[PDB]
Amino acid sequence: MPFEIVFDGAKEFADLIATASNLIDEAAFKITEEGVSMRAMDPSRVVLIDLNLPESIFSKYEVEEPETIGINMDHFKKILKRGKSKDTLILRKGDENFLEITFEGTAKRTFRLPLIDVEELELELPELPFTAKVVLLGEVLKEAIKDASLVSDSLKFIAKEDEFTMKAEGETNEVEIKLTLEDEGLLDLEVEEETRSAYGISYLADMVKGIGKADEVTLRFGTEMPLQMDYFIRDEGKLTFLLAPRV
Amino acid sequence: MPFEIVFDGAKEFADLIATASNLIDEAAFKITEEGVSMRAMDPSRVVLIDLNLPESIFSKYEVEEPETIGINMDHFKKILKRGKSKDTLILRKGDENFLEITFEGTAKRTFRLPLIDVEELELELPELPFTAKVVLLGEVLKEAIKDASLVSDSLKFIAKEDEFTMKAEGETNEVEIKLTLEDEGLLDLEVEEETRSAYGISYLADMVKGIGKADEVTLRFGTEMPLQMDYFIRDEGKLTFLLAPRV
Amino acid sequence: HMPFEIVFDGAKEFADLIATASNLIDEAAFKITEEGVSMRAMDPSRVVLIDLNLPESIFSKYEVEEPETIGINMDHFKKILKRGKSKDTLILRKGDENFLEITFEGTAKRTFRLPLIDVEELELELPELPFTAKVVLLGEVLKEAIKDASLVSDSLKFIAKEDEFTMKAEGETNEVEIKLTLEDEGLLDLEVEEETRSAYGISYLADMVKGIGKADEVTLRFGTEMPLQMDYFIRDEGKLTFLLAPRV
Numbered sequence: 061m062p063f064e065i066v067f068d069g070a071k072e073f074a075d076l077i078a079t080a081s082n083l084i085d086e087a088a089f090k091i092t093e094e095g096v097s098m099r100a101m102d103p104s105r106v107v108l109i110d111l112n113l114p115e116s117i118f119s120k121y122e123v124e125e126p127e128t129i130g131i132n133m134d135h136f137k138k139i140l141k142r143g144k145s146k147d148t149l150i151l152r153k154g155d156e157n158f159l160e161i162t163f164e165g166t167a168k169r170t171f172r173l174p175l176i177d178v179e180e181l182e183l184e185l186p187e188l189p190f191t192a193k194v195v196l197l198g199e200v201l202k203e204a205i206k207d208a209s210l211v212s213d214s215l216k217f218i219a220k221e222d223e224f225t226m227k228a229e230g231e232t233n234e235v236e237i238k239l240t241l242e243d244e245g246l247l248d249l250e251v252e253e254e255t256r257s258a259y260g261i262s263y264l265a266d267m268v269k270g271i272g273k274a275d276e277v278t279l280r281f282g283t284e285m286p287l288q289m290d291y292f293i294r295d296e297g298k299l300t301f302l303l304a305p306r307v
Numbered sequence: 308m309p310f311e312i313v314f315d316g317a318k319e320f321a322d323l324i325a326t327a328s329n330l331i332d333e334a335a336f337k338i339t340e341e342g343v344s345m346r347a348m349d350p351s352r353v354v355l356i357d358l359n360l361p362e363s364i365f366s367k368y369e370v371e372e373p374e375t376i377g378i379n380m381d382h383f384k385k386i387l388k389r390g391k392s393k394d395t396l397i398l399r400k401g402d403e404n405f406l407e408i409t410f411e412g413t414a415k416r417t418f419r420l421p422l423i424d425v426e427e428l429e430l431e432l433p434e435l436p437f438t439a440k441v442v443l444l445g446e447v448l449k450e451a452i453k454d455a456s457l458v459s460d461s462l463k464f465i466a467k468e469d470e471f472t473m474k475a476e477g478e479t480n481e482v483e484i485k486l487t488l489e490d491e492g493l494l495d496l497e498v499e500e501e502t503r504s505a506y507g508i509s510y511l512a513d514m515v516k517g518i519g520k521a522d523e524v525t526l527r528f529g530t531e532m533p534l535q536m537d538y539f540i541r542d543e544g545k546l547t548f549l550l551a552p553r554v
Numbered sequence: 555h556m557p558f559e560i561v562f563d564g565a566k567e568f569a570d571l572i573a574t575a576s577n578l579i580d581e582a583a584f585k586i587t588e589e590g591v592s593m594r595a596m597d598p599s600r601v602v603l604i605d606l607n608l609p610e611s612i613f614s615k616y617e618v619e620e621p622e623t624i625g626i627n628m629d630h631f632k633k634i635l636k637r638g639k640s641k642d643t644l645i646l647r648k649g650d651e652n653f654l655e656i657t658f659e660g661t662a663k664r665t666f667r668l669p670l671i672d673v674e675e676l677e678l679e680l681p682e683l684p685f686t687a688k689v690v691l692l693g694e695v696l697k698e699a700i701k702d703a704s705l706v707s708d709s710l711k712f713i714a715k716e717d718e719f720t721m722k723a724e725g726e727t728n729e730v731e732i733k734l735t736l737e738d739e740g741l742l743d744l745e746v747e748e749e750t751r752s753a754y755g756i757s758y759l760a761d762m763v764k765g766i767g768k769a770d771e772v773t774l775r776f777g778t779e780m781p782l783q784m785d786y787f788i789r790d791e792g793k794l795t796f797l798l799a800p801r802v
Binding site (some may be wrong): 158170171 | 433444446447450451453457458479480482483484485490492493516533
């Protein structure tokens with residue numbers, strides 16, 4: 061009654077939530093007339109995650125009573141993983157303290173996930189003076205991070221006007237992944253000035269694990285600045301990570 | 308005591324035996340002129356299995372004189388798993404005490420499986436006074452059992468005149484799988500009174516583990532009564548489970 | 555150790571070939587000449603000899619200034635090569651430095667630096683042995699037969715007669731026989747001077763065939779109580795050969 065939210069393609073929704081539970085244990089979901097929003101940090105406070113799902117991506121969106129619900133992400137994910145690619149997903153909140161999760165397909169399957177109280181910090185998604193913007197295929201990003209992990213625990217990002225390089229170096233071994241606009245993997249490159257920063261590979265691997273090979277990923281960063289990594293859900297939804305630099 | 312039994316498609320035969328070995332360790336196979344039959348209980352005596360493979364599903368069927376052979380089901384399954392989807396399977400017994408198992412395909416591969424003797428019991432499949440019958444797609448049944456296992460160790464079956472519900476509840480968590488004749492998953496429903504029973508998920512999971520997503524499964528049960536579960540092999544073969552209810 | 559540049563179209567195919575050899579050896583010396591690349595090594599137990607020959611004809615670019623031998627950690631080479639994609643171009647390059655540059659050119663340019671190691675080389679000959687039986691069979695049949703036999707025994711008997719090839723394993727109570735004739739799809743050729751019988755350790759056989767393709771044409775040559783020679787061809791021109799001691 062307080063809200064009813066319907067998404068066509070339950071497995072696609074599960075995959076989106078799964079990306080976020082890779083860094084997050086618990087999260088507050090704010091459900092308004094405009095859409096669903098979520099913002100949280102990983103337990104080490106190194107990564108900020110911001111999820112925005114406008115009502116335009118839902119087949120039915122009815123919010124009688126706007127509110128904020130607390131969800132254990134591991135439990136949520138476990139239930140959503142039961143959804144099939146052709147299932148319709150329904151999120152329903154009654155008067156009681158649980159979220160009703162229904163998969164409608166060859167049958168009607170209804171789970172009750174008890175809501176929890178999550179201590180919500182005031183988290184701001186700041187505007188940052190990024191000097192480099194990179195749009196690249198998820199496949200390239202995911203492979204670069206895997207390549208770098210054979211070598212080191214950190215990955216250097218280097219943007220110049222004509223080339224984007226991700227470089228990792230160990231005691232003896234080294235890997236360099238280089239993209240120019242001549243390469244199929246680089247879809248856009250915008251570089252206000254030469255930009256160099258480094259990031260922990262363990263965090264990057266968790267950020268990209270759920271991203272699809274065909275997905276388009278936007279990176280923004282600055283010298284010794286955080287990395288902002290965005291990808292879009294059904295064109296209008298957006299998943300954003302902000303990753304503290306490595307020093 | 309010679310016989311020769313030939314089945315087109317070794318992997319399909321492997322799959323069928325694999326379903327049965329999920330609960331059975333050893334089995335007497337009765338080999339007669341009309342077909343092959345097998346009947347056994349799991350080690351806890353909670354589930355009875357009945358397998359009937361009429362002569363009509365075999366491409367060649369030559370039985371000198373009816374006889375019963377005892378087979379270690381795990382060993383049998385291990386050999387049968389070596390068969391390929393396009394292999395012809397030949398089951399042959401000479402006068403010696405082993406089963407000759409041949410896969411004929413890109414090569415001729417012959418295994419020798421020693422026969423054992425099996426404690427054969429007062430095992431019959433009585434006709435119980437079932438009050439509900441449900442025919443449903445395997446994938447609905449398999450998914451409901453996986454869903455319920457997230458929540459509890461027992462699954463309640465509830466049949467009314469136009470709805471079949473499988474429900475499980477934990478301390479706070481609950482799931483309900485509902486089917487009506489409007490649903491693609493429900494192929495038939497016949498309910499002569501409101502019927503309610505519960506069954507152990509661990510046994511149900513082992514029973515359906517081998518069933519195929521598009522197999523048509525028939526369920527019969529009564530209130531506080533065993534569950535009968537069967538599905539057909541090549542239309543004429545039949546695999547039947549009878550499962551004790553849970554208190 | 556002069557510079558060279560060697561280019562192979564299809565990085566994943568190259569990785570798979572290297573992976574097959576890495577199943578048995580840990581370190582290998584690669585001889586790079588103007589004619590091609592060759593590698594010969596033994597497994598740590600000295601039961602299996604491996605011989606890899608990759609002529610220049612299978613490489614899309616092949617620039618070698620002077621012949622040289624480089625030592626390579628096969629596990630670290632395989633782990634890098636496993637990052638190549640099926641449509642990547644693979645570039646193996648050496649400069650003046652003592653490392654190998656491994657580049658995948660595809661949707662991006664990915665360059666790894668592999669330290670070269672010192673590999674003390676044994677006096678390894680690929681002897682011309684008087685094999686009395688030759689079998690050409692599909693990799694699918696050979697791989698299945700080794701798996702089948704492993705259900706039963708630790709050794710696999712090879713029996714070649716004029717008209718049939720049999721692989722046979724026996725356990726305490728259990729037994730498997732895999733039989734092929736020229737009427738069979740799995741058998742492409744059979745040439746037998748005299749009836750030939752030998753047996754080989756399945757653990758080695760499994761390691762030898764693990765990387766072989768189900769459609770590859772594998773040639774077997776053996777003799778009674780003699781080693782087994784197993785080879786298959788790469789781009790019809792390169793060749794990977796195993797020589798496996800028999801079980802006695």
